[PDB]
Design a protein around this ligand. Sequence first.
Ligand code: HEM
Lengths: 102, 420, 55, 78, 445
Amino acid sequence: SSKWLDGFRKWYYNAAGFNKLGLMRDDTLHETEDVKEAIRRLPEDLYNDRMFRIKRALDLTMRHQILPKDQWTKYEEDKFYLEPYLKEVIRERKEREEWAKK
Amino acid sequence: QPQDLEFTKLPNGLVIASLENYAPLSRIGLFVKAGSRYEDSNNLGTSHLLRLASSLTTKGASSFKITRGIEAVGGKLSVTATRENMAYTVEGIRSDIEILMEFLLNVTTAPEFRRWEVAALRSQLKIDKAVAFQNSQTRIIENLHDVAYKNALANPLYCPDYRMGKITSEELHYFVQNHFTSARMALVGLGVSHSVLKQVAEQFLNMRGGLGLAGAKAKYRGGEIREQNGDNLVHAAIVAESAAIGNAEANAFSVLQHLLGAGPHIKRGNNTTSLLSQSVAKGSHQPFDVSAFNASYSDSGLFGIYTISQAAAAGEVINAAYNQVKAVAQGNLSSADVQAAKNKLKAGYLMSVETSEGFLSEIGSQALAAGSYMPPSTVLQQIDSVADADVVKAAKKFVSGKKSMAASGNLGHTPFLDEL
Amino acid sequence: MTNMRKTHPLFKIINHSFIDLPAPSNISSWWNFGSLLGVCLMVQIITGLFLAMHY
Amino acid sequence: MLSVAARSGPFAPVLSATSRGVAGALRPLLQGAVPAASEPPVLDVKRPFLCRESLSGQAAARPLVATVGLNVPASVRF
Amino acid sequence: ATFAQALQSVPETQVSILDNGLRVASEQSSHATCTVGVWIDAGSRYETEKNNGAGYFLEHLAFKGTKNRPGNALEKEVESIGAHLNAYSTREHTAYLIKALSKDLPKVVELLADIVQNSSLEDSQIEKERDVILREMQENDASMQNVVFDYLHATAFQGTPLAQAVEGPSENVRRLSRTDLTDYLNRHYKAPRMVLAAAGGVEHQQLLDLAQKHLSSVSRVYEEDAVPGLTPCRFTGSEIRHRDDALPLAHVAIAVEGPGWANPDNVTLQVANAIIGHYDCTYGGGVHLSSPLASVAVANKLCQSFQTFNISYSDTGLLGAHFVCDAMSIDDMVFFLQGQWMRLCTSATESEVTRGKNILRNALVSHLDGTTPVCEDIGRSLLTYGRRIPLAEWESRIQEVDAQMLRDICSKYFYDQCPAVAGYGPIEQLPDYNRIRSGMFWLRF
Ligand code: HEM
């Protein structure tokens, strides 16, 4: 039942509500030390786009509004830009931890 | 037990030299013909950052893994760079030399060159330049090479201040892919057998063409530069063209350099056998030092006078040294002093190769310059074949040649090139 | 690692006040007295609390 | 035509520097501002050479060679 | 080809004693160049504050002419053969060494023999290197590391002959004369305090024949019939601080008392220093250095540099650290350094012990690369230990060091001790002696 899981994933993505604020999935991650290091390694255009998206979301939440439905972040164009940087940061931190174990 | 020096050239031009002396600690260096002379004006200072970028993440080992593995076993890693070529040397125990070879070859062959790493490394670039420019000899030599050549040797070792914060990792990848090619590198090993060197050479090194970019022949320029920076001592270097490496006049220029004086032999001596120091101290009474500066490259060369004098006594010291060299050029010299200069040059060459690191550096330099190993006795007998007329001819070529001057200090009394 | 005395947001006040406070070397015993006042103040409070428990 | 600064036409304020101690009523063109630039690092002072014996050996005689170690301090030879 | 038989394949140092008591030692190698030196057990510790600059002024005068080669003539025959002549003097040793070719061995033995025996001194030369040493001391005042280490030796060995420097104060070099130098030569230049060391392409038989021909007469009789001894020096927990706020950087050295030359525990202490290591601002490593002190110093941008040291003297020594940094970091750096010391007294695990053992192995073997450090090791080893310790013995002594005895030795020498602190520069945030003294013990341990 792959398409049932996929359509349920689309439903959960629409029901989470951050697509109505223009946000991506990687903007909603909590900025811990690994996530902050992932933002620090970003290229500057992606960093500026992310900062504008957070500012727009905070401005929309201030007025208790949402974007119009055509401006919502669609599921197919939601790019997981922070995944390789976060993956590298987790790999390096686990390597440091396993070196500190021995 | 060191039965010979195993010297081999692979068909792609990569040179492997190995000597098995059964030393307690092995030393393995990769010598790449990728010095500071291979940059044009669009990527100046890239060799400085590529020298400092040895501890970055590579395809096969992270920077944390590289550092903790290179110093967990007690080993060491260094990069030695001149204008012509660079050397990546690893050194450690015979038991742990295999992982050191893997770390060295991961550093040299496949660097990743991430953007945040070089962004964090530009600060260390500025700090290293400011530390290395604490000696005024460094600034004088940099300015002397800047004035002496139009291109392809006037590029500095250290990154210029405008280039800091503007060197990208794409230029580093461009430099690596254009200058770290197969027929410009020699892998030299001491305390390690030849077969593992050949296995590492066929494993880690055989994905490069061999030629890359050639160069721009290092045309001569001439002229002078004067830096009023207010120092207690005035440093002046007056240089002219000389022989390149491999000519019959380079050995004569070295013999002339040791005849005029190229360093002290006694701690707190007076340099009685140095002609330049005796000629200057004949009329002077203040602290000073005069030596003969010599440098030989693949296509060009530099020979001249280096003087450290007082602010108000620079002209007398410079004129005394120049008159001494002009007297040497007119045949006014003793053959016994030429014999003493030959003995000094032979002693200095033999003392430069007694240590393992100097031996490795000389083997790598010879393998890059000529592609074959030269035993030291052949070098000594090549020194012995220098005639006195060759020394007179070298001095005459220095006197009659066009000059490049680099001066620094209080230059109110320092003379000019046309006033000599 | 770090220095917990100088970087903790609560311990920074005690470090600035009673641990690494720069003080004159030549102050006499009279400079004790105000500190004694503070001690006497809390002593009063403590005794007063127990005198508030039966009065 | 004397007054060298006025004799040179376009290079009038390049050959002469004009400042003021008391500001005028007329506001100057191109007020200008120094941007916050970087600072050189602080290094410890080096040994001076005020005697002839300490200057012995300080003169350069070889091509300049830099060396950067990992846990070795960076050195240079003349 | 393992490490054990590689260290066993090092040639044995050949040691013989002449009839006057002179030691003669050689290290035969395959090199075409040799290093021959004379080591005399005579330094600033052997001076009675009336000849406090005798060794420095004598080694200034040593290469200025002899009774057989007056003037610069000997200089000619050391500069016409390409030989390099060097000399130095520490607080308890003196060395005169020539590096040359193998063919010029009898001549360099002859020059080393008559330099230390028939050195000609004349009053014009006395005043010439008097003003030269005055200018040398004025130059050496600007090197802050030398000033700090002289301060540390002055405050850690108060009232003893180990406090006085090699150069001595300026009043002595303005008041030393010919007679005191002759007395110093007659008292200190004797055969039972003299080692002739050779390294490189030197056979022991030829060196012994030349030493018997030239160094047979050294006047080893006690002429004054007074025994020169070596009393123990009293370590003093103290501090000296030289406040001068115009200097750009501050140098601080903190050290405790060392065990001595002949203590085996020094080897363990070397491993301890290899755990702490060193750092300079031009290091290419960065955050991922193995030493926690260097890693926290580069993470917090604390220090310009630090380095550990174990200086050793007869029964005594200085075991500590030296760092240069800006003022605003000083106390923080001290705290971290103290923590590292206490970590080695309490929580030394086997991983950093193995790392320090490997670092000590590599440094102690690769230091002896060349004829000059081998000759220096031979001379200093015959003067200090009474014998040349083989390198396999050093390997066997390093191998027995584990974490338990390392923290035992560290608790013996670092824990709850009274250190000596020397500071120079903007050292206002460098604390009192009481905070540093309180930093030598943990309340949690
Ligand atoms: C908040 C803290 C305090 C409490 C709860 C407190 C409470 C009391 C109580 C219940 C009494 C009556 C008990 C008795 O005297 O038989 C008392 C008496 C008294 N308190 Fe306090 N008190 C406090 C602080 C102080 C302070 C700071 C002072 C001044 C130094 C002070 C001065 C006095 C005096 C003089 C008496 C009269 C003692 C006497 O009977 O002779 N109290 N207090």
